[PDB]
Amino acid sequence: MYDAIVVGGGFSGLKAARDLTNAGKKVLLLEGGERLGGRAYSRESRNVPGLRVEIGGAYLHRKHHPRLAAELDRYGIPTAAASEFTSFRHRLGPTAVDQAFPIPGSEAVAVEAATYTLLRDAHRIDLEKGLENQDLEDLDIPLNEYVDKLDLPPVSRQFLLAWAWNMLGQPADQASALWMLQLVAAHHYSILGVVLSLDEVFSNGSADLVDAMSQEIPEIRLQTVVTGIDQSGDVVNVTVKDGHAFQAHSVIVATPMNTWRRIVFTPALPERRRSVIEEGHGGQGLKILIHVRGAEAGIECVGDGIFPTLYDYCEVSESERLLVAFTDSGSFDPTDIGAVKDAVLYYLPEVEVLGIDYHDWIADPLFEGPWVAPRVGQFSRVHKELGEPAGRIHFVGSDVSLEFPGYIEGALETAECAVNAILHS
Amino acid sequence: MYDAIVVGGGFSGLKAARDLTNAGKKVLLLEGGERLGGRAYSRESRNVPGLRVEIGGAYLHRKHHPRLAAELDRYGIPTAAASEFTSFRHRLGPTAVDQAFPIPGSEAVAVEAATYTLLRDAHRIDLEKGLENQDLEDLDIPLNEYVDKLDLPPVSRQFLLAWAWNMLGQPADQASALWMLQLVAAHHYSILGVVLSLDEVFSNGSADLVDAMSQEIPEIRLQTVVTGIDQSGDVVNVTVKDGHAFQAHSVIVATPMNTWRRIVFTPALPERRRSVIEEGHGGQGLKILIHVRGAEAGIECVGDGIFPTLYDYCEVSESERLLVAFTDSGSFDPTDIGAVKDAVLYYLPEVEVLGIDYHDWIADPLFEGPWVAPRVGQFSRVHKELGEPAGRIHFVGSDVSLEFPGYIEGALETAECAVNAILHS
Numbered sequence A, B: 001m002y003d004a005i006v007v008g009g010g011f012s013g014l015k016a017a018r019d020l021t022n023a024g025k026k027v028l029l030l031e032g033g034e035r036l037g038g039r040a041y042s043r044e045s046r047n048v049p050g051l052r053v054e055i056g057g058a059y060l061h062r063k064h065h066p067r068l069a070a071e072l073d074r075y076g077i078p079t080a081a082a083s084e085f086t087s088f089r090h091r092l093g094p095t096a097v098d099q100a101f102p103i104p105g106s107e108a109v110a111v112e113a114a115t116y117t118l119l120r121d122a123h124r125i126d127l128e129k130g131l132e133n134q135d136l137e138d139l140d141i142p143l144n145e146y147v148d149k150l151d152l153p154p155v156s157r158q159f160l161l162a163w164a165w166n167m168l169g170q171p172a173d174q175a176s177a178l179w180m181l182q183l184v185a186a187h188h189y190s191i192l193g194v195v196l197s198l199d200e201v202f203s204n205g206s207a208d209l210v211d212a213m214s215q216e217i218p219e220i221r222l223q224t225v226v227t228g229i230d231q232s233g234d235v236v237n238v239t240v241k242d243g244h245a246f247q248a249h250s251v252i253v254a255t256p257m258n259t260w261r262r263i264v265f266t267p268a269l270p271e272r273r274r275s276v277i278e279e280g281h282g283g284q285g286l287k288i289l290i291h292v293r294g295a296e297a298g299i300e301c302v303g304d305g306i307f308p309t310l311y312d313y314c315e316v317s318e319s320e321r322l323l324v325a326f327t328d329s330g331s332f333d334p335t336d337i338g339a340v341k342d343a344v345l346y347y348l349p350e351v352e353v354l355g356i357d358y359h360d361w362i363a364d365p366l367f368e369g370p371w372v373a374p375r376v377g378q379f380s381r382v383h384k385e386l387g388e389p390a391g392r393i394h395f396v397g398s399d400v401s402l403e404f405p406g407y408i409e410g411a412l413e414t415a416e417c418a419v420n421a422i423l424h425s
């Protein structure tokens, strides 16, 4: 029996388990799958033999993500610039300019005004308090409605919505304005920052850091799926699918929010949390790697397409590349290759689609979602409390970060807090 | 004896006198000089025979300036686009881009943040209340200090300061931040707007509108300088330099603020006003028309030069143009042609200066200034009251507009208010 059991071996679980270990605690890490890293998942390309790709999250920015930066520096993990954008192929109408910031002068005054409004609203958010605790209900409405009130002209309107579709992984009518504003706040109150944070990637894949961290964790069980967490007794009992139980003074739940509903908690989690946990968050982000021929290097496309964004990912050969598209799984079916072709050709009529690669995070029973994004109305009801302890059970992960939700940095941040909580218990 | 005497035949005096006349009042217009129009002064170029130029104010924007737009439409006065900018020759450092908005991407995040701060501060200003009545003292500090707090990188910093130098007609250490913010507010709370308002000019010169308005004013005396305004009696007595006096129930002072100190008021003006009136405002704007050879069409220069801005004014021939420079008379001596050459060559090393044309508004005893700009500390002490009546004496003009100070539109606006005041008396 253990000082702490950590459930889930994503970056959150990994940090917590490592850090508690180095604090001299006796720790066990239980991972349901056959790998560590969770929604950070580097692996071989399905389309291009020998080519490593990121099929989950990977993009980082050292300045927005200091914990991550610290980890990289700690283990000497090399990073590289994200693919540069040099050729612009937007679908934003005839008045758009083909650069990274495609807003024409005729829209400048509109954009000035909207910048003030957006930032004013974002500045309503204290990142420490929780989105439920700040009288922010009026902002927790469908993004399309919020944006309609901004009355933006066509280029800026669609540019904003496209990036929002990318970043939230929800269509505009499902996304919450408040959450959009949360992301703005998270990036030191910057709209620009949200997209500029696509700055660097792992030179050798995210697995590089995963492996470095795991090497400092002495006891790990893979293929071990937690089904119950019971703290009715003096010591927490953790039940497992096909397995003897394990026991600890403290348990850290570092599994994805949308999977908590599959664990039996005893006693039941506090009532305020229960509805959101049952329903799950609304994240439907879909990241598709597209093997192509006939694409020049350095392409970026933003527009009104079913792929809001489509852009350069990596060189494969002189003639071939990977692009990456973002959309959502509600709106798009990646098993329909005809649909993929149409989506690509809309932006890039000269380009041949050779194949695609993605992971269906939503269908994955260890995840039941990509990155976090609330349904409208969820997080102005309950948010901070999702990441707060219930007795000896802690809750960590990107999904519950107040500071950087939906990012690796939020995984690290939340772990820190739990580790500290436990050490001072 | 008259219902109203209007003193000064700028646009303010002209509107007031016309409008009171058409309301069936008996009006006299007293003008000190040999012309009407005041600080709107179209005339023949000193450098290029047969060429009409504006030596005072002229630029308008129908959307920011609805009264002016109404006057133009009233009399069928043709306007034309201000000279277009197509060749950019900035002095903003090596990272600047040569377009009208020269901010590079590397500065974008800085500019986003400053945009919020600037607009937040400007939104503190209610345009109806007066700058002295709103607890705005903290902003009434030297512009350089305010801008220092913004911590802008080099291109945006200098771009802002250059345009501010142009627009306020004061060096940064003399300009008031609060006034800068006033101009922003005046332009529907837009920084961009301040410069985009340089939109159109009079096709046939500002005199076109001056003449149209004056034709509706039946009694005008030129070369008639008011030296005294005495309302101790039942009827206001207006004394004149070399002249019998004139008498009226109401007097409208539509002379420039910096000249009021030359009139004897009886009784004395209200005490709060007296200090500012004695000292005068701090406006030192200097608009220099520069006859050049070797300049391509469509040039715009903004930078750190003693001319903050230097830009295309009009074609003269295939080889010759006029440019226009803005600076201030504290900082620059336009009688020093060597200085002019150096100032121009800084931006445009290929260009030969043939000559210059300007009017020394500061030395002109009928003006004692170009357009209004307060000294630091003036207008957070007293502002609205400068434009309020003292018994039967009204005060109008651009200089005292709360809504559009320093612009033709402010002349029209202030006149409206006085006319209405008088009609409802």
Ligand SMILES: Cc1cc2nc3c(=O)[nH]c(=O)nc-3n(C[C@H](O)[C@H](O)[C@H](O)COP(=O)(O)OP(=O)(O)OC[C@H]3O[C@@H](n4cnc5c(N)ncnc54)[C@H](O)[C@@H]3O)c2cc1C
Pocket: A007, A008, A009, A010, A011, A012, A013, A030, A031, A032, A033, A035, A036, A037, A038, A039, A040, A055, A056, A057, A058, A059, A060, A224, A225, A226, A227, A254, A255, A256, A259, A263, A285, A286, A287, A361, A365, A366, A367, A369, A370, A371, A372, A396, A397, A398, A399, A406, A407, A408, A409, A411
């Ligand atoms: C498509 C996609 C793109 C992304 N893009 C970026 C990006 O660009 N930059 C960025 O910073 N982030 C990005 N992310 C978000 C980021 O990857 C995640 O938020 C982060 O990796 C989550 O780490 P975590 O430790 O909270 O959870 P996870 O990594 O999800 O770890 C959860 C662990 O729980 C395990 N588990 C689940 N149920 C059980 C159970 N019952 N018992 C035992 N173990 C269980 C899972 O197998 C897993 O290993 C992206 C995510 C996705 C999916």
Ligand SMILES: Cc1cc2nc3c(=O)[nH]c(=O)nc-3n(C[C@H](O)[C@H](O)[C@H](O)COP(=O)(O)OP(=O)(O)OC[C@H]3O[C@@H](n4cnc5c(N)ncnc54)[C@H](O)[C@@H]3O)c2cc1C
Pocket: B007, B008, B009, B010, B011, B012, B013, B030, B031, B032, B033, B035, B036, B037, B038, B039, B040, B055, B056, B057, B058, B059, B060, B224, B225, B226, B227, B254, B255, B256, B259, B263, B285, B286, B287, B361, B365, B366, B367, B369, B370, B371, B372, B396, B397, B398, B399, B406, B407, B408, B409, B411
């Ligand atoms: C260099 C310069 C550039 C400008 N640029 C622009 C611009 O781009 N766009 C814009 O809208 N505005 C501009 N303006 C500002 C605008 O021109 C003025 O604010 C406006 O014309 C003032 O009109 P007014 O009726 O208040 O005063 P004025 O036009 O000054 O009229 C005052 C009248 O009082 C007369 N007078 C003075 N003393 C006496 C006396 N004691 N007795 C009798 N008569 C007297 C003067 O002769 C004058 O005719 C500019 C001004 C200058 C000087």
